[PDB]
Amino acid sequence: PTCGGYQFTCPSGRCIYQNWVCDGEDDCKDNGDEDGCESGPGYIINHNDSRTCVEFDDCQIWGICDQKCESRPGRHLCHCEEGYILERGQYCKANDSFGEASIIFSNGRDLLIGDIHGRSFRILVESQNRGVAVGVAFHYHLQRVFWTDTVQNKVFSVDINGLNIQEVLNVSVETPENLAVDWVNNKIYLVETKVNRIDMVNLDGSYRVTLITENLGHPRGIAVDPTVGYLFFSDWESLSGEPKLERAFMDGSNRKDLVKTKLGWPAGVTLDMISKRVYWVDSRFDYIETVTYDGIQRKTVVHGGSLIPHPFGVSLFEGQVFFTDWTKMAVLKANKFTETNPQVYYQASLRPYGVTVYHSLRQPYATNPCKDNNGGCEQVCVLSHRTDNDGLGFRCKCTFGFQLDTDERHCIAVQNFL
């Protein structure tokens, strides 16, 4: 594409440096740069008019369509993508062909799976040896659910039924909070808060590589978008004492702060891949916001102390977002666009930490560039932005104890480190 992966696309079609998206100066004449970073209508309404209803703008209303909106001259068309059955002309419910979505959450000790309607709640797996589950992630194609246990300092995988529990990491993961699973490349992205690092491993833990650790102070959330090759994570207290919800390539190459305003304690992060938006909850400021992948059109979904007092983790599916709140100790439910009253999907005595929606649509299929003979890499083939690496979209990284060779595809033994 004409616009680079680490660049923002002007309406005109010119690429702009990523830090300039909300730099404070309209680098894009089109004013696309700095387009409503701050978080602070109708049709038939005739502004100062007897009968001249405001033309407003087609498909320019926050919440006009659950998905891509086709702008019509005097109306709107709420188009729904593949696998999405249109409902009421405004909502894009999933295709019944795919099984009912499952809300996988941790009550505080054990990992629970329930139907998206909330009729029943079975326990997928009970943490043993006094352990507690914190973060959840899944790979639908392989029907595997991954969860971390801070008390046991271990990371576990299990089948969707609740059998064949496997231990993937137990060496140095002392306090892993959250996980993100790259279903396309079969890679697990792990956030370790014991030493404030983000490590990426295979589904079997075969190769471990530390990706982003430049200034991590207190990482709390993580999210990956294999289709576009992006990596989103949040820190509620950096080294400089500055919370930095940041977008970076899957290999953590072009780090860039995404939100730089009203960012108290960014706890959870989830990505709406269809609408290309980032939904992050703030535990301190008590608000769940939403910006695009470039952090341009900031929208406040739910705000207010009473409604969302202390969210930790948030997951999105269709027109609904499932966010867990520590203060209310409940897996609350909210509308994707705007909700005036959170819905209590489930309540637990302990404080819930993890939440995810188990559904085939949550992980759309995409090509894996690493399928081409491990991307020609001697070691870990890490996906990057589709545009990155001459458009190949993948990079070669070496495990611990090995160093990238001059060819950048081979791995020689390490020589010097302090």
Partner 1 sequence: GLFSFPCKNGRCVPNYYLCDGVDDCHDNSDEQLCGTLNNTCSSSAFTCGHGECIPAHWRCDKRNDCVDGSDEHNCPTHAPASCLDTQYTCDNHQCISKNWVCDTDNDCGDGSDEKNCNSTETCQPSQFNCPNHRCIDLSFVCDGDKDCVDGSDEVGCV
Ligand X SMILES: *[C@@H]1O[C@H](CO)[C@@H](O)[C@H](O)[C@H]1NC(C)=O
> Which spans of this chain sit near partner 1 (rule: CB under 8 A)?
109, 130, 262, 264, 284-287, 303-306, 309-310, 326-329, 349, 351
- The distance of closest approach from Cβ of residue 170 to ligand X in the complex, given in angstroms and rounded to an integer, is 4
Query: Measured from the CB of residue 285, what is the shortest distance to partner 1 in angstroms?
Result: 5
Using an 8 Å Cβ cutoff, are 284 and 264 in contact? Answer: yes
Nearest in space to 172 (alpha carbons), one of 187, 154, 184: 154
Residue with tokens 């990706």: 211
Taking the complex as a whole, the smallest distance from the CB of residue 108 to partner 1 amounts, in Å, to 10
Tell me whether residue 341 or residue 367 sits nearer to partner 1 (CB atom). Answer: 341
Place of tokens 């006094």: 130
Residue 310 binding result from partner 1, ligand X, none, given CB thresholds of 5 to 8 Å by partner type: partner 1
Which is nearer to ligand X, 12 or 129 (by Cβ)? 129
For residues 141 and 183, what is the distance between their CA atoms, to the nearest angstrom? Answer: 8
177 phi and psi angles, rounded to 5 deg: -85, -60
Tell me whether residue 144 or residue 333 sits nearer to ligand X (CB atom).
144
Q: Look at residues 319, 414, 377, 417 and name the one whose alpha carbon lies nearest to residue 116.
A: 319
If the CB atoms of residues 23 and 237 are measured against partner 1, the closer one turns out to be 237
Question: Least CB distance from residue 167 to ligand X, whole Å?
Answer: 4
User: Least distance from C-beta 85 to ligand X, angstroms?
Assistant: 6
Nearer Cβ to partner 1, position 105 or 230? 105
Q: How far is the CB of 324 from partner 1 (least distance, A)?
A: 12
3-state class percentages of the chain: helix first, strand second, coil last, to nearest 5:
5, 40, 55
Is the Cβ of residue 170 or residue 367 nearer to ligand X in the bound state? 170
Residue ranges in contact with ligand X by CB under 6 A: 95, 97, 167, 170-171
Q: Work out the burial of residue 132: count CB atoms within 10 Å of its CB; fewer than 13 is exposed, 13-18 middle, 19 or more buried.
A: buried
DSSP state of 231: E
d(CA 171, CA 402): 19
Residue 171: name its binding partner from ligand X, partner 1, none (Cβ under 5 to 8 Å by kind). Answer: ligand X
The option from ligand X, partner 1, none interacting with 95 (CB < 5 to 8 A, set by class) reads ligand X
Residue 89 touches which member of ligand X, partner 1, none, C-beta under 5-8 Å by kind: none
Report d(CA 255, CA 114) in Å as an integer: 36
Which of ligand X, partner 1, none binds 170 (CB below 5-8 Å, type-dependent)?
ligand X
Partner touching 305 among ligand X, partner 1, none, CB below 5 to 8 Å by kind = partner 1
Provide CB contacts within 8 A for 125, sequence distance 6+: 110, 111, 133, 147, 156, 158, 162, 165
Closest distance of CB 86 from ligand X, Å: 9
Nearer of residues 329 and 392 to partner 1, judged by Cβ: 329
Q: How many CA atoms lie within 13 A of 60 on its CB side?
A: 10
